[PDB]
Amino acid sequence: EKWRIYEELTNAVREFESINPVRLIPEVGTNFVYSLPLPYARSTKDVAGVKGRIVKYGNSVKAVGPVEFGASDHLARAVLTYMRFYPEYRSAINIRYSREIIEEIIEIAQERGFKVSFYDRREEPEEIKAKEGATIPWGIETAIKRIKERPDIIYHLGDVGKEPMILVFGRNPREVLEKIKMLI
Amino acid sequence: EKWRIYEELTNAVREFESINPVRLIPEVGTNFVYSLPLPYARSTKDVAGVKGRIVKYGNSVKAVGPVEFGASDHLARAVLTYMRFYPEYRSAINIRYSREIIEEIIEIAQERGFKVSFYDRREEPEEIKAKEGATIPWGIETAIKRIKERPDIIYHLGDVGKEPMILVFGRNPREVLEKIKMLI
Amino acid sequence: EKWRIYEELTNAVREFESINPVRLIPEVGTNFVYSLPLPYARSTKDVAGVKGRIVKYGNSVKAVGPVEFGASDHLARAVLTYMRFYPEYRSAINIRYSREIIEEIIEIAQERGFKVSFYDRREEPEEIKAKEGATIPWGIETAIKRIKERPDIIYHLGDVGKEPMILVFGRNPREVLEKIKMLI
Amino acid sequence: EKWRIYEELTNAVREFESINPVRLIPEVGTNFVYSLPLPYARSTKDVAGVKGRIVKYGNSVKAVGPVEFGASDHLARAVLTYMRFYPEYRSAINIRYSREIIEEIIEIAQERGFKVSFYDRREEPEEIKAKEGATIPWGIETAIKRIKERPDIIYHLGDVGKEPMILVFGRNPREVLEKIKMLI
Numbered sequence: 001e002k003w004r005i006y007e008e009l010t011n012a013v014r015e016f017e018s019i020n021p022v023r024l025i026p027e028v029g030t031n032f033v034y035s036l037p038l039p040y041a042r043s044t045k046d047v048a049g050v051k052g053r054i055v056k057y058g059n060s061v062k063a064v065g066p067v068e069f070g071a072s073d074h075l076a077r078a079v080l081t082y083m084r085f086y087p088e089y090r091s092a093i094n095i096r097y098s099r100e101i102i103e104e105i106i107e108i109a110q111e112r113g114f115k116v117s118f119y120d121r122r123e124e125p126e127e128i129k130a131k132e133g134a135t136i137p138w139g140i141e142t143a144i145k146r147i148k149e150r151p152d153i154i155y156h157l158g159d160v161g162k163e164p165m166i167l168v169f170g171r172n173p174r175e176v177l178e179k180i181k182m183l184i
Numbered sequence: 185e186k187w188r189i190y191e192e193l194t195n196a197v198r199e200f201e202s203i204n205p206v207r208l209i210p211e212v213g214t215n216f217v218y219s220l221p222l223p224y225a226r227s228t229k230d231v232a233g234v235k236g237r238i239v240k241y242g243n244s245v246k247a248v249g250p251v252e253f254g255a256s257d258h259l260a261r262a263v264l265t266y267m268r269f270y271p272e273y274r275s276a277i278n279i280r281y282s283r284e285i286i287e288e289i290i291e292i293a294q295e296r297g298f299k300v301s302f303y304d305r306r307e308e309p310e311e312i313k314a315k316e317g318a319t320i321p322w323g324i325e326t327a328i329k330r331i332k333e334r335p336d337i338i339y340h341l342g343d344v345g346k347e348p349m350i351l352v353f354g355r356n357p358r359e360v361l362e363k364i365k366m367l368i
Numbered sequence: 369e370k371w372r373i374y375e376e377l378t379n380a381v382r383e384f385e386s387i388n389p390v391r392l393i394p395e396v397g398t399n400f401v402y403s404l405p406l407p408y409a410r411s412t413k414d415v416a417g418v419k420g421r422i423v424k425y426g427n428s429v430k431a432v433g434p435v436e437f438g439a440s441d442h443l444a445r446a447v448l449t450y451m452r453f454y455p456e457y458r459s460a461i462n463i464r465y466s467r468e469i470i471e472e473i474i475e476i477a478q479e480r481g482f483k484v485s486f487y488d489r490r491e492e493p494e495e496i497k498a499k500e501g502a503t504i505p506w507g508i509e510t511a512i513k514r515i516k517e518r519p520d521i522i523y524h525l526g527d528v529g530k531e532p533m534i535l536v537f538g539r540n541p542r543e544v545l546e547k548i549k550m551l552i
Numbered sequence: 553e554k555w556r557i558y559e560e561l562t563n564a565v566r567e568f569e570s571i572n573p574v575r576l577i578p579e580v581g582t583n584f585v586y587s588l589p590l591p592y593a594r595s596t597k598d599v600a601g602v603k604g605r606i607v608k609y610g611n612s613v614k615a616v617g618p619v620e621f622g623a624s625d626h627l628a629r630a631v632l633t634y635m636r637f638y639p640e641y642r643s644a645i646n647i648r649y650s651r652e653i654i655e656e657i658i659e660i661a662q663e664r665g666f667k668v669s670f671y672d673r674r675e676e677p678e679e680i681k682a683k684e685g686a687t688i689p690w691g692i693e694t695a696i697k698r699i700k701e702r703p704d705i706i707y708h709l710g711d712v713g714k715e716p717m718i719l720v721f722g723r724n725p726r727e728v729l730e731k732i733k734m735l736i
Contacts, residue, residue: 027212122709130498161342306525314682395580529710
């Protein structure tokens, strides 16, 4: 349970840093999470993330803090919502978006054969926009229901005051880290 | 020169953290800078900033790294451009924007008596939007030329893929930190 | 009553076309409305407007339909809200926005002792954006409260899916049209 | 040639009004154009359109002016670009966008073996946004290349200051109008 979660993620984070993925880190920082399995995964508190995320350091990246349950808020909701459809995928990571990265992700998905969906906040029902915290889950579902298969990659373009993101899911941190490795 | 710059900023950053300004930290992180005086201030390399900025940690903030020249890129250009109008103001800091913070900043500026200007990227000439790195300086000038006096505070609302910011300037880090202290 | 209104608006409209203000017409078309008096003016049905508005023809403008009560809706609701603060200002017109046009208006505002204000859908709380047709009222109220004087001109920039607009008011069509001319 | 074009578009327009498609008209108004043939169709001047377009009247629509060559500009440039890829598709119409309308189009697209594509001004390089009237060509090219088939319908969501739009094409006005009807 918990220890295994804390160890596997803590390792992935260390390896993530070692491969030095600077071009992939957004401005808000990258968080890498690993949730508890259902039905115990009821809140972001049940999901382990990097406290302070991982930010661009010099010509490298740095995890500001240690792995702790309740560390991540936005990515946890995403993975948590995603589990409502694929309960085995309790790991995820958010990386920077840009034409190059997405084009290159598309190509690789094409090759290694795996789905990528998305969601556009411009197509979001005002009412949902109104309710706080309802947007991230809305996006995940929209994206998930968009295609027929399971999307390993879900992204969205920017919106007023909000930057674009690329989310990549895995059943555990090692698998997530593996997709990232490919991206290079 | 340099040592004095490195010391004064390094102290302010330590004090900034101590006052624990979590509500004021944006998602992209807060950077606090102190530039070299003209004519030596020719690039962001001549400006000292926090490497990795200062991010929300727990119910607090944390400066990811040490103070170094060339640490800041976006705020340095802002302060650098600002100096073209008020060469004595080589310090600045960017904090989170929101109705509350701005309303409260307005009120205080009213009280302690000091100017606040702004710029809107929606009123930005396409051509400028086109040239990379020309936007931050454009904003600063627009904001500076907007009012007749010197604006200690310059902010801007969000835009597609970009969040809103509140910039506050001072002639040195101590003065900047003092405006922030008031904000509480 | 109604006849005096109908006659006046109908004449101002005919003269607006006559002066040929093509560059001041927006893509959505310009509308010119004149409301009944308080408390009669209880809805957009109590306001007279151009059916099908006035639109760009060739290198000229053209009124699409005749003046009728209820013809307008948006511009009508705007003047309705505006009358809560200045009951005698029952006439208004909406014209194309542009840096060039708006600056002209400023100059003239200064050169003629007229006041101009604005509002921003970005500073609009999400809650209000959720209630259909609650935005126009919000805008007008916002712009009027932004200054102590009565704003003859109220504008706003573009928003996702919505174009910028400049609304000019007056006691009657003559006053309103009278201003258009200075601008021209 | 020109007369056959004039006559056909003029009749389709008269019938469009006749079917009363109010809910399918945008605030900027709907235009219906029919171009000459390649290589004759060398500019928007070689394309026939509704002067002053067709706009919303009451609970009905109305053509503001007669059919003339060069009447259109945007819709005309769109079909011009579209003809570089499908030379025989010289007719097009632009209609109001909305989740409800677009979904209907999808269903019908599926239920009638028609293809639909789109473009996004957000994925538009800043360089292209800088060159006046280079966006429409960009959009059409983008949407057409997004899929291997010919897209009968090309749409796009709203952008700052610009509304969303759904463009439907056809070999001639009958084909185009023919589709509008299914939608209705």
